[PDB]
Design a protein around this ligand. Structure first.
Ligand code: 6Z6
Ligand code: ASP
Ligand code: NA
Length: 399
């Protein structure tokens, strides 16, 4: 019994270091909290956590583009459509199951919007690809193009480009071979970036915990709702569909959930979720390159629940809330504080004052660290479900 735990410590070396990083980060952050805090000085303190974020952001661009180009090229017309339909149906249901779970819990325990739709439409079709790799569109930072990255515009273009090569046969093969080499090469860089994660995660959360009262019971509604949907609803869905153990599946992606908690960005933790599914859970690359990049921005289960709870909490009808909370879920990017920005849209539709968001902002960060964990988990189990379901398509692609 105790001799068997030594084989666990030798193997899970990096997984236990990121756990210890959280345990130490919560300690050090609370230890350095009574000291005279400063914006400039907190920025200096949280710098080892800042370098990890830069390393992971560096890899999101060559991952998104290479994954979707090879991923769609490697599949037939009806195959990618069937693969897509299995993913979309899953994405639509899980975000609807989350908002229904969110609305019921907030009802039981009660504690420029056109421009937004236009900007998103403008972002699905970028005017410049070199630009899209570091800028997004936000109508009104110079002009209407905000510094970021159009993750959605790249996902949409790379998809049609991957389809085009998968339609031009052997002429397309060269570029597919080129984009395949690049996908693996960056997946070798995420191996290097993985040994820095325990040091980074420690400082990312220690710095964040160095920063009327009714919000405590609002924070409870969200956190409880995330556990019911995350550790009870989603594992049940996987066990019902795949007929496989979900809590041993969650053990593989556990290294990525901790980094989602540390960074609070599902797009920035994508290179690690890719490594955790392809390696630890042994999910097919032909489907992880398909499910995960789209899952980063479109499937946001934890955000959808947070959009429903926070909208009804500031009321201190439901049909419009459930429709726009699922709408805000899809819209919002896998970036920190994204839910808070899309909350402006979910409050305008119902008729509540948008200035009421100011009450939430203070707590928001701590809920976002868990919101991302459920947003990531929904894609990991999503890929696990789609891989298992698309069994016949994958068997046809082999010889
Ligand atoms: C809100 O935006 C999205 C965009 C895509 C998707 C689906 C997805 C996932 N996950 C991925 N990786 O690829 C495809 C999907 C389709 O359903 C459509 C699918 C598809 C089928 C057949 C031909 C295509 C040609 C070009 C692009 C997609 C094509 C590809 C879902 C939501
Ligand atoms: N932080 C979340 C997005 C949000 O703010 O809801 C994510 O990246 O999954
Ligand atoms: Na989203």
């Amino acid at each position: 019994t105790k001799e068997d735990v030594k084989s666990f410590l030798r193997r899970n070396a990096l997984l236990l270091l990121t756990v210890l990083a959280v345990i130490l980060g919560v300690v050090l952050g609370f230890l350095l909290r009574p000291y005279p805090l400063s914006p400039r000085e907190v920025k200096y303190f949280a710098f080892p956590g800042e370098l990890l974020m830069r390393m992971l952001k560096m890899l999101i661009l060559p991952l998104i583009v290479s994954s979707l180009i090879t991923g769609l090229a490697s599949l037939d017309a009806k195959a990618s459509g069937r693969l897509g339909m299995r993913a979309v149906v899953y994405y639509m249901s899980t975000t609807i199951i989350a908002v229904v779970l969110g609305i019921i819990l907030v009802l039981i325990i009660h504690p420029e919007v056109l421009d937004c739709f236009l900007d998103l439409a403008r972002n699905i079709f970028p005017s410049n690809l070199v630009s899209a790799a570091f800028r997004s569109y936000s109508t009104t930072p110079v002009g209407q193009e905000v510094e970021g990255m159009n993750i959605l515009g790249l996902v949409v273009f790379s998809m049609v480009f991957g389809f085009a090569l998968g339609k031009m046969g052997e002429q397309g093969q060269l570029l597919v071979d080129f984009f395949n080499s690049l996908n693996e090469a960056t997946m070798k860089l995420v191996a290097i970036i993985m040994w820095y994660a325990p040091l980074g995660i420690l400082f990312l959360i220690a710095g964040k915990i160095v920063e009327g009262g009714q919000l405590g019971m609002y924070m409870v509604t969200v956190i409880v709702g995330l556990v019911i949907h995350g550790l009870i609803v989603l594992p049940l869905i996987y066990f019902l569909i795949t007929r496989k153990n979900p809590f041993v599946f969650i053990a593989g992606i556990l290294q990525a959930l901790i980094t989602a908690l540390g960074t609070s960005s599902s797009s920035a933790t994508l290179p690690i979720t890719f490594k955790c599914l392809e390696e630890n859970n042994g999910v097919d690359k032909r489907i992880t390159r398909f499910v995960l990049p789209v899952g980063a921005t479109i499937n946001m289960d934890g955000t959808a629940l947070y959009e429903a709870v926070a909208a009804i909490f500031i009321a201190q009808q439901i049909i419009t809330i459930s429709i726009t909370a699922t709408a805000a879920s899809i819209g919002a990017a896998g970036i920190p504080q994204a839910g808070l920005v899309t909350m402006v849209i979910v409050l305008t539709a119902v008729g509540l004052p948008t200035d009421d968001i100011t009450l939430i902002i203070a707590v928001d960060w701590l809920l976002d660290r868990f919101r991302t964990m459920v947003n990531v988990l929904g894609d990991a189990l999503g890929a696990g479900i789609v891989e298992h379901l698309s069994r016949k398509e994958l068997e046809k692609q082999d010889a």
